[PDB]
């Protein structure tokens, strides 16, 4: 069973998004065999001139851009006459069937949040640029499409339809109030169109960042419509999220992002102002379109270096805008590590880095983040390490509900797949920790070699000044056998109260130098006793078991879209629902038991050991600046005056 | 290629209603085969629980009523399962189908308005005592059914689903204005939902009455919403119609029916002023339901007395309330002839009616329209006649449109209908003037043989009297020979002085009774040479042409759903839109030439009849009023006093 049209042909089976003034089916082009997505204007719709949807036509074939859905047709049913639109087809789905995965039940990955916010923001612009803006912007009418660099492109759809069949052709019967009611509506193209999108758009931003909508009553926005009214209207500037979470309880506030959301720190402190004034709901203060376009683009056109605090043991995205200095990269590197611009010690690769006043961003070491710029400080702080959500595991109700099956599935698929994320991010702090202590031993080794470098230079200055003075006070004590030896001694004792002080520094250096040896005492060993491995293969056994779990899900997904089952199916369904319970309980008793409480050690022995080796670095500067000092003050004994002859 | 249940199954070709949220369709019962109107649920729907559904089902079973739809069932599509509602099939249509009919272009037939208001009101009544208010009454959700007895019964429908999907699942991404618009839609339950649905039952009884909207701008309410939106709001108490005739023009202001209304006079004096406040965007002077019920079943109780103008050649529908006295009978017929009580004199069956003070109006003569009451006055007044629109033909376009030319059939077909209807009810009102003027004569001619019944009884009185005098005096004058010759004399001569008188009247009389024979001077041979007969049959003439234009009326009408036509089907097109303009030009000029001017003739010539027999019967009354004087002035000498003797 199917409809047609000229070109065009899909089955009623092949129904997609499903909407009310229309539908869209999955369909072909009948000649090549090409996937199109059809939207056939259900069963009114068409009394409208031709002229009107021609010129509609020619100005929607305008849309010519990456993130709006192509406009390919304007067609017509065989058999039955009633208007079909032939656009792109998106095999992916939706912003919406994205944040439906569990994996993204916490929020988007960082990238894919990028992409979001470039791809929706640009298809407003070129929206705004032309005819049209679009009224409101959700998950749900934002299609997918995987790019051919296999990373997605979004695309808005939905906005040429801004027809009008509601109302209650009850038109010509109705009160003068019901007309008020549309004065009351046709007061919104005003201004409070070009400022009213922004809303839905920063829902929907918040929605993609944190996996969860900004406002949300006891048990659902639609649920309970009242206390969604009173605390929409009813928030204050700032203020990006509240949540009522008791039933008729008050309202929790925040102007941050939940702990669950994992996007960089970087990142999300240049997201939550454009969130703040995005969501209000008075005058100016609403930025309007222009400011929003200017800022969103100044924050996606940045570059982000990777930096790693290994005193902190923290993990960080620096968002600069390329064409800037490195000076105002220490004063970001600042602004979220607390560590001021002097103070800030750089590593890459095993070396030290340095950089200057004005570096621009361009030609910085290219970074990833599992090889960046390691950071460290002078001033002796504390681990603070991973910030992460803890989230337990919901109840699983003893019972028999395929829907409450479904949606119990997907709770706790999300919640061991947060569990595998975090894991995976802990084992990674362990790993930039070990490669950043290794390397830091190595330098603090470097500088002791330059030391000693030093320290022999003018070891040798110092003998041949002795050696020579005595070797001048021979050939005279024998030669002109006659007498001044005081001052030739005074300064010859001076030479030699200098060369105590050498031997102090000589003995004191190779002390320093056998507690870098491998021996002990500042050694490394515990980043090989303490903490997580690759080689415990904690991360996979997560992912078994979220596997597991997930084919638990689609299955118990599958069965509530069946609606009820048979009877072996039943008693199957129950017998996973208790598997299900187990694997995910094994799961979350694994991160807590082997990767928490490892992780926990090594960082705690990381900091009991990042205060060993700032005190024994303090020292090596000490005896290094105690090294110049003897240098300096040996070379005011290469020219010593003589007394004036005859 | 069809839908099916359980029980019920449907082609999706029999579609009927057609709407937006849903659909109806023509469907059958698969067991019994009975005929039912099904309403599947389009393509959303169902996610509400069974629970509210059964207990919505439950409340709609309640509804058991003779203006109600039934509804029968709710069940479930087989392949598909989403909601389908079994509901009665309604053959007829609805109210909208009736008035699409040209016969009603300028509004129903009165005794089917009755029914309408009945119908509607007692639906509204029976809906209002229990749940459910109905929001808005059209005639496109009034079903006619056509009962036992053949007269139509109305149903009202659409009225369960208050379903809200509109809005704009854009609910959890709208800006706090959006719901600040939903706080000015739930303010209409307040109380603008109990006066609310009036406007539109208001408006709804004004179409089915003048075949019109009430309110219409240049070239219609929808084409055109803000003048539309300016009228509306913009009108004062007491209007019920505000037409905009000209382009840019301003607007006609009426609070009565249009001119092309045939509600009798009576019906219309009852009707706008329900119109009027029921048409009211303000506080307590919009009545309000329970008044609004009690009003209008006051009018549906009422029962219709049919009386007829021979003066003003007006025919005239009572409504009396049955319990109610003839005075306020005499007082109606007074309130529309403008003939006060005592003036009034009233015919029925070719005999004098006589009622009095108290006579109830249920034991009153029964009378239709073709047998009423006829009624005169006694006071020289004018004729007036038929008060009807002059309705011209459109201009038949020189051109070729099928949709354009399906219009203009439709109003041509309305205007020749609207002329049969006008020659049929001239007809009628020149018959009632014959039969009625043939009874009159012959009731002057009792009045008459009464009169001389009178005459010749005070004549033998007279002539017993003057025969006795003489007998006496004769009696005397030759027995007692002697003599008082004076009295005797003097009261002959009185007698003979009333004889001279009689004869004077006897004379008179003689005229007065020439005048009535056939002969001529107030004949009423005019009435068969002067008028339209049944026997010119003008009315199925104006039929026979009525039929030719409404064939082609149809065909014009499929020549429009078939969008565009062969080559011989539209050269066909064309010949029969030109045979159209000859069909109905022919009929109009036979309307004119043939109707109307007859139609005055004998109306001018019955002016011209009128005064000489009121004048006749005012020299009989005055004549008769002389016998009884007379006769009384002759009571006066039947036992006269004698002299006393001894
Ligand atoms: C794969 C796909 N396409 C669509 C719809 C569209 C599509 O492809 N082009 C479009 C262009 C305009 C509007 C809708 C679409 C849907 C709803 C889904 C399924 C989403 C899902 O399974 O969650
Ligand atoms: C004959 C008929 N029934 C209907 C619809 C209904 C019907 O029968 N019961 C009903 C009960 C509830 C709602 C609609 C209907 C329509 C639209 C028409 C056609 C009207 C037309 O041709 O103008």
Same mark, same amino acid.
């Given at each position: 069973?199917?409809?047609?049209?000229?070109?065009?042909?899909?089955?009623?089976?092949?129904?997609?998004?499903?909407?009310?003034?229309?539908?869209?089916?999955?369909?072909?082009?009948?000649?090549?065999?090409?996937?199109?997505?059809?939207?056939?204007?259900?069963?009114? %719709?068409?009394?409208? $001139?031709?002229?009107?949807?021609?010129?509609?036509?020619?100005?929607?074939?305008?849309?010519?851009?990456?993130?709006?859905?192509?406009?390919?047709?304007?067609?017509?049913?065989?058999?039955?006459?009633?208007? *079909?639109?032939?656009?792109?087809?998106?095999?992916?789905?939706?912003?919406?069937?994205?944040?439906?995965?569990?994996?993204?039940?916490?929020?988007?990955?960082?990238?894919?949040?990028?992409?979001?916010?470039?791809?929706?923001?640009?298809?407003?612009?070129?929206?705004?640029?032309?005819?049209?803006?679009?009224?409101?912007?959700?998950?749900?009418?934002?299609?997918?499409?995987?790019?051919?660099?296999?990373? %997605?492109?979004?695309?808005?759809?939905?906005?040429?339809?801004?027809?009008?069949?509601?109302?209650?052709?009850?038109?010509?019967?109705?009160?003068?109030?019901?007309?008020?009611?549309?004065?009351?509506?046709?007061?919104?193209?005003?201004?409070?169109?070009?400022?009213?999108?922004?809303?839905?758009?920063?829902?929907?931003?918040?929605?993609?960042?944190?996996?969860?909508?900004?406002?949300?009553?006891?048990?659902?926005?639609?649920?309970?419509?009242?206390?969604?009214?009173?605390?929409?209207?009813?928030?204050?500037?700032?203020?990006? %999220?509240?949540?009522?979470?008791?039933?008729?309880?008050?309202?929790?506030?925040?102007?941050?992002?939940?702990?669950?959301?994992?996007?960089?720190?970087?990142?999300?402190?240049?997201?939550?102002?454009?969130?703040?004034?995005?969501?209000?709901?008075?005058?100016?203060?609403?930025?309007?379109?222009?400011?929003?376009?200017?800022?969103? %683009?100044?924050?996606?056109?940045?570059? *982000?270096?990777?930096?790693?605090?290994?005193?902190?043991?923290?993990?960080?995205?620096?968002?600069?805008?390329?064409?800037?200095?490195?000076?105002?990269?220490?004063?970001?590197?600042?602004?979220?590590?607390?560590?001021?611009?002097?103070?800030?010690?750089?590593?890459?690769?095993?070396?030290?880095?340095?950089?200057?006043?004005?570096?621009?961003?361009?030609?910085?070491?290219?970074?990833?983040?599992?090889?960046?710029?390691?950071?460290?400080?002078?001033?002796?702080?504390?681990?603070?390490?991973?910030?992460?959500?803890?989230?337990?595991?919901?109840?699983?109700? $003893?019972?028999?509900?395929?829907?409450?099956?479904?949606?119990?599935?997907?709770?706790?698929?999300?919640?061991?797949?947060?569990?595998?994320?975090?894991?995976?991010?802990?084992?990674?702090?362990?790993?930039?920790?070990?490669?950043?202590?290794?390397?830091?031993?190595?330098?603090?080794?470097?500088?002791?070699?330059?030391?000693?470098?030093?320290?022999?230079? *003018?070891?040798?200055?110092?003998?041949?000044?002795?050696?020579?003075?005595?070797?001048?006070?021979?050939?005279?004590?024998?030669?002109?056998?006659?007498?001044?030896?005081?001052?030739?001694?005074?300064?010859?004792?001076?030479?030699?109260?200098?060369?105590?002080?050498?031997?102090?520094?000589?003995?004191?250096?190779?002390?320093?130098?056998?507690?870098?040896?491998?021996?002990?005492?500042?050694?490394?060993?515990?980043?090989?006793?303490?903490?997580?491995? $690759?080689?415990?293969?904690?991360?996979?056994?997560?992912?078994?078991?979220?596997?597991?779990?997930?084919?638990?899900?689609?299955?118990?997904?599958?069965?509530?879209?069946?609606?009820?089952?048979?009877?072996?199916?039943?008693?199957?369904?129950?017998?996973?629902?208790?598997?299900?319970?187990?694997?995910?309980?094994?799961?979350?008793?694994?991160?807590?038991?082997?990767? *928490?409480?490892?992780?926990?050690?090594?960082?705690?022995?990381?900091?009991?050991?990042?205060?060993?080796?700032?005190?024994?670095?303090?020292?090596?500067?000490?005896?290094?600046?105690?090294?110049?000092?003897?240098?300096?003050?040996?070379?005011?004994?290469?020219?010593?005056?003589?007394?004036?002859?005859?």
């Amino acid at each position: 069973i199917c409809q047609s049209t000229s070109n065009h042909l899909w089955l009623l089976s092949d129904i997609l998004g499903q909407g009310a003034t229309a539908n869209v089916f999955r369909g072909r082009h009948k000649k090549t065999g090409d996937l199109y997505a059809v939207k056939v204007f259900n069963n009114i %719709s068409f009394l409208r $001139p031709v002229d009107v949807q021609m010129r509609e036509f020619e100005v929607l074939k305008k849309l010519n851009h990456k993130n709006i859905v192509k406009l390919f047709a304007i067609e017509e049913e065989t058999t039955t006459r009633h208007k *079909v639109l032939i656009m792109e087809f998106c095999p992916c789905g939706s912003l919406y069937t994205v944040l439906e995965e569990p994996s993204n039940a916490y929020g988007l990955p960082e990238s894919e949040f990028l992409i979001v916010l470039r791809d929706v923001v640009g298809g407003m612009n070129h929206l705004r640029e032309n005819g049209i803006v679009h009224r409101d912007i959700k998950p749900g009418n934002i299609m997918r499409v995987i790019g051919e660099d296999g990373q %997605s492109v979004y695309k808005l759809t939905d906005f040429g339809a801004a027809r009008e069949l509601e109302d209650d052709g009850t038109e010509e019967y109705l009160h003068p109030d019901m007309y008020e009611r549309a004065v009351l509506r046709k007061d919104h193209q005003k201004k409070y169109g070009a400022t009213v999108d922004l809303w839905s758009v920063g829902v929907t931003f918040y929605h993609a960042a944190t996996g969860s909508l900004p406002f949300r009553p006891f048990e659902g926005p639609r649920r309970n419509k009242e206390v969604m009214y009173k605390i929409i209207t009813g928030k204050p500037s700032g203020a990006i %999220s509240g949540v009522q979470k008791a039933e008729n309880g008050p309202i929790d506030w925040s102007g941050d992002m939940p702990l669950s959301c994992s996007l960089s720190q970087g990142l999300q402190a240049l997201l939550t102002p454009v969130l703040a004034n995005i969501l209000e709901a008075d005058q100016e203060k609403c930025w309007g379109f222009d400011q929003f376009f200017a800022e969103t %683009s100044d924050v996606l056109h940045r570059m *982000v270096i990777h930096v790693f605090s290994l005193q902190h043991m923290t993990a960080h995205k620096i968002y600069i805008h390329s064409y800037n200095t490195a000076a105002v990269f220490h004063e970001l590197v600042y602004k979220q590590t607390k560590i001021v611009s002097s103070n800030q010690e750089l590593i890459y690769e095993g070396r030290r880095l340095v950089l200057e006043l004005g570096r621009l961003a361009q030609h910085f070491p290219k970074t990833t983040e599992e090889n960046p710029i390691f950071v460290t400080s002078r001033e002796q702080l504390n681990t603070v390490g991973l910030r992460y959500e803890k989230i337990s595991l919901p109840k699983i109700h $003893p019972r028999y509900d395929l829907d409450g099956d479904a949606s119990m599935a997907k709770a706790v698929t999300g919640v061991v797949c947060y569990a595998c994320r975090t894991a995976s991010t802990l084992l990674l702090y362990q790993e930039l920790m070990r490669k950043g202590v290794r390397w830091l031993v190595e330098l603090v080794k470097d500088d002791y070699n330059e030391t000693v470098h030093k320290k022999t230079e *003018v070891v040798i200055t110092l003998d041949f000044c002795i050696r020579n003075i005595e070797k001048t006070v021979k050939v005279y004590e024998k030669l002109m056998k006659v007498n001044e030896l005081g001052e030739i001694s005074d300064i010859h004792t001076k030479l030699l109260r200098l060369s105590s002080s050498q031997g102090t520094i000589e003995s004191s250096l190779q002390d320093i130098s056998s507690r870098l040896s491998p021996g002990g005492l500042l050694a490394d060993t515990w980043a090989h006793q303490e903490g997580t491995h $690759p080689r415990d293969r904690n991360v996979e056994k997560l992912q078994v078991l979220l596997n597991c779990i997930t084919e638990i899900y689609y299955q118990f997904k599958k069965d509530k879209a069946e609606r009820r089952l048979a009877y072996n199916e039943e008693q199957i369904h129950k017998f996973d629902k208790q598997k299900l319970y187990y694997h995910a309980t094994k799961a979350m008793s694994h991160f807590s038991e082997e990767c *928490v409480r490892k992780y926990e050690a090594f960082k705690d022995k990381s900091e009991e050991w990042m205060r060993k080796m700032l005190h024994l670095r303090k020292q090596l500067l000490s005896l290094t600046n105690q090294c110049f000092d003897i240098e300096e003050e040996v070379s005011k004994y290469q020219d010593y005056t003589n007394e004036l002859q005859e």
